[PDB]
Amino acid sequence: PQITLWKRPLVTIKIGGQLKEALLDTGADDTVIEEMSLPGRWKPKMIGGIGGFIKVRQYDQIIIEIAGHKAIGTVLVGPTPVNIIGRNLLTQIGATLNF
Amino acid sequence: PQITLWKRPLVTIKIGGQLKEALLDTGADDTVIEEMSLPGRWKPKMIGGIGGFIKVRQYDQIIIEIAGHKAIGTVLVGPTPVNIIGRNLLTQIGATLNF
């Protein structure tokens, strides 16, 4: 698909069997989801945004569907205002920015 | 162009007669530039993201050249860690996400 930007580029994702909404975000290095349970061990990570830095939980090699495209990769879990799909998984689904 | 997302999508902009580097950010509603002077009236605004909120100055009807494409719109100025081109100006240059 071709997604214009007049509205927030929100898509449905599936993770842990659960459907969620997330923002496709080219300004994010990493994928960040609201508090939820994921399998396996996690490692610490600090991420920075407009307001400063936060601590999140890094889970590696997580299966996630994005707008019907399969991805398997790192998901960060922490207090984000919105679920964000970042470049680490946008590259897996073949996304590009065009103008 | 077509911009792949293996790397941060950084482009050159011209604003207020100055060249700057900025991030093309589909997760951003608004455009936010590091502290600089702009002409005309402004009003205070708070904007938020990961890490919380910052106070910015809102300038309307500002022209910006983005990777050679001129656009006009609202620009926010404040202590952002990165210059961000948000959807309010990405729409004007016809930017889309494609996968």
Binding site: G27 | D29, I47, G49
Partner: peptide, 5 residues
């Protein structure tokens, strides 16, 4: 809302 490094 603006949006991570």
């Amino acid at each position: 809302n603006l949006x991570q490094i």
